[PDB]
């Protein structure tokens, strides 16, 4: 038998198959099975807020027609323009940008009809979609990503978009992304669309994505904790040179203010407090108090020098140096200690609530 | 009965249907009803001064011509290709740029035909629409969007425009925008448009939006703030040491000023003077003033040790010293009342002016 | 009579109207009239060199054919998809970029056609277009961005633009511009193209345009003024303070560079010297200046106690303060007064340049 | 003989050559061989992850049919529209991005076909490609870029692709990249693929970088060690004046972090820590040493002065004013040794590594 | 006679006019002569290292067929649309990017047949090529674009490309470029190319850009040049005072590397050394030296201050005055003589090289 008359005799002219038609009109809707296998992910930004993932979908569904039943072979393999001739399932995403089909020499359509007529429709897209992420706790969060199936044209009745029992979703091995792990769960379940034209299916796939806390350690961590460090040894010190601490605890205040307004700025504007906030003020705040405790100390000072230009003032030379040198000792000590303990607070409370979230 | 043979019969060579009349032809004007629903907002800023809005589009109009009557069900559901051959409504954007529709898998378009005529044509599309936003008050200010759909091809007679009575604009459940509050009212109201050419129907929504103050007080009120506190403390402080008081001055003014070009930087170029510049401007002023004071109170010290230098210099030794340390005094307590109760003035008229507004 | 059998008959298959012909042909040239309207404008910018323009564009020429002179109405509407059978006249224009029409629903085209076969074409389309901008004076100019059309393939013989006598440019009601101030004269001036080929005709439109001065007073020269204010102020104060002085007078400096560099970014670069590199190189000189007369005085003073550790010594101790206080007192009042003369000079100059421009 | 004639018979309607066939239909598998030349490479940065290349392809593979054997010549070159008409093979790339064709005047298409019917078939296409690059080592690295060549739809059965065993791979001559040098090497490696739907054939290509060393040192290393040098220098002298040494060793810092976070940001974020990371830290942490030992000199000092305050404290006063010189003078020659033993350590163990790998 | 009947004559369904045999078939090769005029230039970008000019590309080829020879008129002019039913040369660029066809209300083509079938044939595009431009001096250098026009499909053999004697490449009238000055030299060349599968011919066009050296000086030598001669008045000033030395001598080389970065930005990454490169060597080492050079003077003044701690310190307490005295007064003059003679060799050098390349 020729190839070409039965390629043509079964989705053809003489055939009254139309492409118009429904399969199984006037009947039970039509069970439509979809595989989602990801080719690669990547291009994840805050101030984006969408993803781009590069997606191989494989949809199957029963046809009665085209069960040519003469042919020994279980299956043909088809070429991209007999995927025209055949009617094909609507397909849509809530929330779709882009998604342009690849094209290179032919298109990256794959079709498979089986002699039952059950039908294998296969496509390469990129799919860039937005992701409702959130910026609660920017150094630590977990990132769930949603992709949703639904169908523009049809209703509930007429057409059931199910997942695969087994093998739902795939990945393709050895693949990562630098900033976040992604979390081999993929729970996927189903939410129904209601409009006021009628009720839509729709199916749900979901993405955890837990962030790499190495960057950011490195990138604001370390020099804010530097910074601070120098700045309590240096005040502690030079007591003597009063010019010398204030210009050391304004450049120390300086610096720390421009770099907190620089770690600001990738990440978009959102009225909460996050995390990395909570620490860069508290930071300040142990900067800023410096300073203040250096001007009370120079204040007390100032009281001795007047007292003594004003035996009855060597009665209290020793009250007001005992008392100034009585601050700076305390102080000194006091404050790694009320700055360690705040640490330990910050990183137990956090560590907690990752795990148990 | 076939489908196949009633769907060509209804809409093809044998129906005298032409595409290229208007239904109701030498009668009175075909009136057509739009209802807009928002898939998602997003994508607005200043600088760009438009917005990115995902729309469904339904459109509403009888049509005498395709009146079936012989088939029990109410309504067709029919395929994408059809509406090619169906006469369509005209519909243009007063302000559009890019409008590209979304052709994933298949267009993303609905048809359905009532058993009267009545046609639902359902379209999906990004619209990109430049707004007027004004750019008064930056902090608190609330914009809005307007969106306006003419004819561009017919004049007021023969296609009339109307809007639903109930749930004429329907918005996604749970949508929101990071910067701004949308508010639920969405007031709409139609203005014609009058040209040379001829007169041509309109219709316009109004879309408010509030601004959250959270981000602008973290990111530019609470660093000029403490910048000011500290030039304060530390000026009044550390008085005998006039070299560590004039560099603490003049570096505060430096930081004062870069950021507020810095804080000049999002926003587009306008000839009216903000609220930001307004507060940006009386802080560098009250920094700036600072210095000024401490050079009069050092020229004061220079008269008093060139007299000195010069009983009769203790004459005036008491009283240049008491006249300075009159200034530095009073001076001292008299800054912060003079700027809480500006800060106080500016709160509440920005307050009411916003809740009058 | 049927609609559809005149609208064939017309422009069809019994018709000999074939869109490959020039009406009147081997006949006098086609006089082609053409009217402008501006939907809107923006994009303009000195680093793109460019303004994109929403226009609407209604061409009218007379055609002998297709005058029917068997319908009562004057007029008839047409549709889209009927401009491709009629012959249209070919539109260029000489510094055009992207342009592509824009197709939301249906093509923006309209068709009417006159009972004495005048026929009106109208067209809505985005224009990028090249401006040859002025750099000479940033502040303050005037920048004038003209318009070309002109036919690419028909000579000068066979086909003529002319421009409409009466509201031949009209602009959108309400339209206004951030940065630039439109002017209502709009000159229209038509200039022939001479090639290699051919005499090819041509119209241009000029548009004037007038740049708001209010924001770059409050960027740039505000910041610099104060700067150049607390120089001086702080120079001339604490005087016996060497280091003091040095060290505000370095930091005014470096402010003032960077200011200036951070100034010449926004626009392009060009051979030529604009006034702000003038302000900005002045401002430079007289915080440059400062220094040096600082260290003139120091190494007065420096020869004083030199020669003073060396009466002999007290026969020169007064003639050596003398001169160096009759320095410091000089320059003090001498340097605002010898700015103030000059930045009234600036004013004059520039303001009665641009009057007369 | 009329070429017309031939042309259509050859490959035309009264010819049974169905593009829908493929070739050998029910027999052996058809071997295709690809060779590729490379036209120009650039476009490769860290952030994008991927490289721009234009390339050449050309596909070799036997026909059966289409073997004329009656035209003296003994290959016929053929149009691009003549491409259509005859079967294609599919190919397609594992990570493929744009990729748009080429079509300027005519489309860029070469089609040669033999007597004995084997068909070259020869495109030439801009191909963006993810490359997976290391980022392990900063400075020196080699980057190896893969391009792999599927079929997507047809299984290892029924099409094979294989190399070229003689001049595989060819570039184009006195192509040279600014950043990177190309490896004259080109190993080529088949691996094949396995899916859930089947098993399809594919083939790689890897291309060896080289990272040119030049432009890294003169950015970065070279101004890092002459702070380095300064902040030595000046800490050794000026021992006296401790406010001008405290000033000196806070800017050097400062400078010092705001370089490190300038020197993170053209390449992206990893977990893992660069050897430029690594030189950064030591070149910090020496510049961070010296402030320490500044002020452990000044606290020693302040010992001395206070116990001198209080013959009994010339007992001490050589001892303290010995032991701090001693610190200064060990110190001072100390550092810059081991300084040199790290520098020496780091470029050998990365010299030795870079050539090992 | 109608022209309509003898349009479709000449090239239509009677006519044996194929469009896929090239002419003169089985004959020597067609030679095409290639006229080029430049529109417009721009959009030069070392980063980029392309540029994007508007050109009209006019093709002119002998044909036999067509050769009508019974219109009286010489010339006659078709239609674009007519275009595609003639034969057409293949053009390609060696280096094409873009170069997407302008079509705006019509193609932008012409095409003009003479008497004895000498075909024009007129195009409008916009070519982006890249540029391999030469980095070696930045601030004066020439650089030279090549343009390069190939046959995809042909060889050498029936297909050869020829410039135009007189008026080959001609330019916009009043063009002008803001960076580059263009040469009126325009030098052209053919270079044939060889390939594994065949010679194909080529033309290439090189067109000379002269650097504006306007912009830099005002960009970068100025600001450098003031820095420096502020930084050796005040070293050589106040050198009593060295605190306030050695803070003047670490702000001014802060600047000065910050500067020389920042310099270093808009042109890309490179091995080799530039001039400007070597401009900020040379003055951030005389900024370098000066503040060793202070070191050392405080050193020598530390040896005489202990010396007289412990006449015979009188002995030496010229000697050390003299001495540090001595090396103050000499570096003082003879540093900018040692800069001017550098300035006068460099600015010489650089001139002649310029001159003579
Ligand atoms: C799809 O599945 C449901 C539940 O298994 C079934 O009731 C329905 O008949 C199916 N639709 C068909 C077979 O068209
Ligand atoms: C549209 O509505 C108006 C007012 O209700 C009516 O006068 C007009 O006839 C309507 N147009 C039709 C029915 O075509
Ligand atoms: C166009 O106008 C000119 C001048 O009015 C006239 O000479 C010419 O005949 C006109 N062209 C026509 C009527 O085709
Ligand atoms: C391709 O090559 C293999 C191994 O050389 C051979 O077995 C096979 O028959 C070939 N396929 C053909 C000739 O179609
Ligand atoms: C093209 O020119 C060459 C040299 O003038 C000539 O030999 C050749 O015959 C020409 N090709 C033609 C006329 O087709």
Redesign the interface.
């Known amino acids: 038998m020729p190839?070409?008359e039965f390629?043509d005799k079964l989705m053809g002219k003489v055939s009254?198959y139309?492409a118009?038609?429904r399969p199984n009109?006037k009947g039970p809707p039509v069970n439509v099975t979809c595989?989602i296998?990801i080719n690669?992910f990547?291009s994840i930004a805050e101030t984006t807020?969408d993803y781009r993932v590069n997606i191989f979908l494989?949809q199957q569904w029963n046809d009665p027609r085209l069960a040519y039943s003469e042919y020994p072979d279980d299956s043909l393999?088809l070429?991209?323009?007999?995927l025209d001739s055949i009617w094909?399932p609507?397909?849509?995403?809530?929330?779709?940008?882009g998604?342009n089909f690849?094209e290179?020499?032919?298109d990256?359509?794959?079709l498979?009809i089986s002699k039952n007529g059950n039908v294998?429709y296969?496509?390469?897209?990129?799919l860039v979609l937005?992701c409702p992420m959130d910026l609660k706790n920017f150094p630590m969060d977990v990132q769930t990503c949603i992709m949703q199936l639904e169908s523009?044209?049809?209703?509930m009745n007429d057409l059931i978009f199910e997942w695969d029992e087994k093998?739902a979703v795939?990945v393709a091995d050895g693949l990562t992304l630098?900033?976040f792990i992604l979390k081999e769960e993929k729970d996927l379940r189903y939410c129904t669309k209601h409009?006021?034209?009628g009720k839509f299916t729709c199916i749900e796939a979901r993405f955890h994505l837990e962030r790499?806390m190495?960057?950011y350690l490195?990138?604001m961590y370390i020099?804010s904790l530097?910074?601070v460090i120098?700045s309590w040894?240096?005040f502690w010190?030079?007591?003597?040179?009063?010019?010398?601490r204030?210009?050391?605890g304004?450049?120390?205040?300086?610096?720390m203010?421009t770099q907190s307004?620089?770690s600001?700025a990738s990440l978009?504007?959102?009225?909460?407090?996050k995390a990395i906030?909570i620490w860069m003020a508290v930071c300040?705040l142990f900067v800023?108090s410096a300073?203040?405790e250096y001007?009370a100390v120079?204040?007390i000072a100032?009281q001795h020098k007047e007292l003594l230009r004003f035996k009855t003032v060597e009665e209290m030379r020793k009250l007001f140096i005992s008392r100034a040198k009585r601050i700076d000792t305390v102080s000194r000590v006091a404050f790694p200690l009320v700055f360690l303990i705040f640490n330990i607070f910050y990183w137990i409370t956090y560590k907690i609530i990752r795990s148990e979230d």
């Open positions: 190839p070409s390629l009254g139309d118009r038609i009109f595989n296998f690669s990547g807020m494989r393999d070429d991209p323009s007999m094909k609507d397909l849509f995403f809530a929330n779709e940008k998604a690849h290179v020499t032919t990256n359509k794959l498979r294998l296969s496509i390469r897209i990129t937005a523009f044209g049809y209703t093998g795939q630098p900033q409009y006021n034209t790499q190495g960057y490195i990138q020099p530097l910074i120098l040894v240096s010190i030079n007591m003597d040179a009063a010019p010398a204030v210009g050391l304004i450049t120390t205040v300086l610096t203010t307004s620089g600001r978009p504007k959102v009225s909460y407090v906030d300040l800023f300073l203040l001007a120079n204040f100032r």
